[PDB]
Ligand binder design. Structure first.
Ligand SMILES: [Ca+2]
Ligand SMILES: [Ca+2]
Lengths: 155, 75, 258, 46, 106, 45
DNA sequence: CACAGTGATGCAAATCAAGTGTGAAGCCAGACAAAAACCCG
DNA sequence: CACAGTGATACAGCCCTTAACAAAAACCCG
């Protein structure tokens, strides 16, 4: 709302808001296991998170950005989504855990969201972009070979 | 405009002004810590000098005089 | 609705009821509208389960500032594992929202710290300590103790900081004044006796491991740390022909007394 | 038990300098073991 | 043997004011809608302004509104989260402040 | 940075049990990352 | 072009204190304007 | 018989509302 006010727009506008987010996922080591009952949990961890980047309304003919993260690489804006104590190399478990999220993402990629802000139904659309991945995970997920292969580039 | 005629009537029946209670029903038939130091004692003791010797001015001049007196003398 | 009007219009509706209230205040009290209205409002507050707001109201009725001593803020900051930065953030937030000071600023805490650290209280050993200075205001003495650090002598690759032993014992004994006083008071002993107390202290030392090193200038220090500590375990007094127990650590193996 | 406190104080309650961390950690761990300060936190039980 | 109005407990003060309690209730529920606390603080603010005071008026406005001398739950939540306070630690601090000060700040 | 915050929360801001540590850490991190609470800390303007 | 810390230090800015006379913003007795939001006309 | 935590859950405790009585602490009069 403050971004809408600062760009010389009207607050009662309910146009289609264009949102773009940033996805990330990394594995972690040296996550010690605890005593007690439960399954044989490995000593590793894999995290998955998302982060909005900017919001832009189409006003008149061209576009105008309403909000954008000033500190894109800050820890105060990395919203966690999924947390599991598994191995980033275990392809079976990794896919079994991440397939529902990917299904939800694919289903959302072609829909609009009616949402109330200040008492006015607003329309939202999303553009998902995943860049917070190291080359190892990219090679493991995109169906490529390891880093020591002869094909060296992922572009 | 509601006050001009009232002020004129007030001048009228006042030229012949502290009684507002008995005036209510008149307009009906008309419109129809911190322990001080040596300097604070100096102030509290020598300000009445200039406050009583020259009371014609406020104590701003007394403060100005006490200050120019302290700056010229020792402690 | 009601009571949501501005001036010269909210009284226009409750005028009659205020007249009745002042009539009763003249009948029984004699004109004490202030007390009867305040008490009626307090009861109206307590009827709807609002003890917090009513207690705040009856506290502000006195007109005194609810402030905290710097020692209390220091104890809260230490015993709750708060860095100076987080404490400053909380202080700033509270002072800016409430519009008043409830905690003390950092300089007040830092100033109050000096009372607890060793080298603040006077004392003297009746037999003068051999090879030990008599000055009683030293703080954190260097650990190397004036060791030669030139190029000709044995190489030095360590750093250390430590207090003085006697000053540390004096500070530890002064930190437990109320405990010893209450112990003497609980043992049918007068609290003004000056008998030759007997203090028993436990000593401990162990080297740690996996101690990471920092970048930057200075000497090349290893990745191991050794610490040395003490603990006042028991204090007794010799009254008559016995040894009355006036103090004893209830939790010796705890970290709060090492 | 105090080794734990040492580690945590060095990681979170000291200057991150090679020639300043020792005295800071020492002073903080000394203040943390003061019964005078600990009596304040237990005043509720009175 | 009348001592004073504040020298009695809540129950006794209620026994002493029951008359005007019932009267104000039965005369504010007829036409004024029926909100008791609203009429109460309005009459108190009027009797306070009568003394032409601003300090007390602003104090009670801040108390009744929830802006001064007492934090909102979201505010203390933000303080507890953004300062890494544990729930046990925060409860200890809350208990200590309530015991020493005697006024619930959190 | 979130990995660092996770290491901190799993150790000092969660129940020490396999059955509930992850939910606690996730909820605490979600609360920490929120902006509605961070505005109350910028009470300097 | 990571960033929110981590503590001390050092300097700049706000304030308080005592001194005291005036100056000024309220409230208040009714009151009969001046809109002004409900009803529908 | 280490010990200070560590977050959600449950229950006891202690406050608050209709009840007319009824027992404890004190002057006017005798
Ligand atoms: Ca990794
Ligand atoms: Ca060891």
């Amino acid at each position: 709302l403050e971004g809408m006010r600062s760009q010389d727009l009207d607050d009662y506008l309910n146009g289609p808001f264009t949102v773009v987010v940033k996805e990330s996922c990394d594995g972690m080591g040296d996550v010690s296991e605890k005593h007690g009952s439960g399954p044989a949990v490995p000593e590793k961890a894999v995290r998955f998170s998302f982060t909005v980047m900017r919001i832009t309304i189409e006003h008149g003919s061209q576009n105008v950005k309403v909000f954008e993260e000033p500190k894109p690489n800050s820890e105060l804006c990395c919203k966690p989504l999924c947390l599991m104590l598994a191995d980033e190399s275990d392809h079976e478990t990794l896919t079994a855990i991440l397939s529902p999220l990917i299904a939800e993402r694919e289903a959302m990629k072609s829909s609009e969201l009616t949402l109330e802000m200040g008492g006015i139904p607003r329309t939202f659309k999303f553009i998902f972009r995943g860049t917070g991945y190291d080359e190892k995970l990219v090679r493991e997920v995109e169906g490529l070979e390891a880093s020591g292969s002869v094909y060296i580039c992922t572009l | 405009s509601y006050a001009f005629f009232v002020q004129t009537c007030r001048e009228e029946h006042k030229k012949k002004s502290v009684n507002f209670s008995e005036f209510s029903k008149k307009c009906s038939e008309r419109w129809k810590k911190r322990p001080p130091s040596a300097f604070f004692l100096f102030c509290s003791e020598y300000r009445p000098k200039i406050k009583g010797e020259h009371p014609g001015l406020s104590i701003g001049d007394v403060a100005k005089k006490l200050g120019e007196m302290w700056n010229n003398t020792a402690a | 609705h009601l009571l949501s009007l501005t001036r010269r219009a909210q009284k226009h509706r409750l005028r009659e009821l205020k007249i009745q209230v002042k009539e009763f205040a003249d009948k029984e009290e004699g004109g004490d509208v202030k007390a009867v209205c305040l008490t009626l409002f307090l009861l109206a507050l307590r009827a709807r389960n609002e003890h917090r707001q009513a207690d705040e109201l009856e506290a502000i009725m006195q007109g005194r500032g609810s402030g905290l001593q710097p020692a209390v803020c220091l104890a809260i900051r230490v015993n709750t594992f708060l860095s100076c930065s987080q404490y400053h953030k909380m202080y700033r937030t509270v002072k800016a929202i409430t519009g008043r000071q409830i905690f003390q600023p950092l300089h007040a805490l830092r100033n109050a710290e000096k009372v607890l650290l060793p080298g603040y209280h006077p004392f003297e050993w009746q037999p003068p300590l051999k090879n030990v200075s008599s000055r009683t205001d030293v703080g954190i003495i260097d650990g190397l103790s004036g060791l030669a650090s030139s190029v000709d002598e044995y190489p030095v690759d360590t750093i250390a900081k430590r207090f003085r032993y006697d000053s540390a014992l004096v500070s530890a004994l002064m930190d437990m004044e109320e405990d010893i006083l209450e112990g003497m008071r609980s043992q049918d002993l007068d609290d003004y006796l000056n008998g030759p107390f007997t203090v028993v202290v436990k000593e401990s030392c162990d080297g740690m491991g996996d101690v990471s090193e920092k970048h930057g200038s200075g000497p090349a220090v290893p990745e191991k740390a050794v610490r040395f500590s003490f603990t006042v375990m028991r204090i007794t007094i010799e009254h008559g022909s016995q040894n009355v127990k006036v103090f004893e650590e209830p939790k010796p193996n705890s970290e709060l007394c090492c | 038990s105090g080794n734990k406190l040492f580690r945590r104080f060095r990681k979170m309650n000291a200057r991150q300098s090679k020639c300043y961390e020792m005295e800071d950690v020492l002073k903080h761990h000394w203040l943390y073991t003061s019964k005078y300060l600990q009596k304040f936190m237990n005043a509720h039980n009175a | 043997p009348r001592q004073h109005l504040l020298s009695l407990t809540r129950r006794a003060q209620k026994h002493r004011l029951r008359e005007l309690k019932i009267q104000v209730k039965e005369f504010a529920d007829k036409e004024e809608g029926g909100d008791v606390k609203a009429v109460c603080l309005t009459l108190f603010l009027l009797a306070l302004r009568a003394r032409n005071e601003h300090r007390q008026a602003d104090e009670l406005e801040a108390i009744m509104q929830g802006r001064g001398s007492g934090l909102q739950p979201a505010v203390c939540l933000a303080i507890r989260v953004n300062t890494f306070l544990s729930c046990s630690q925060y409860h200890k601090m809350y208990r200590t402040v309530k015991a020493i000060t005697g006024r619930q700040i959190f």
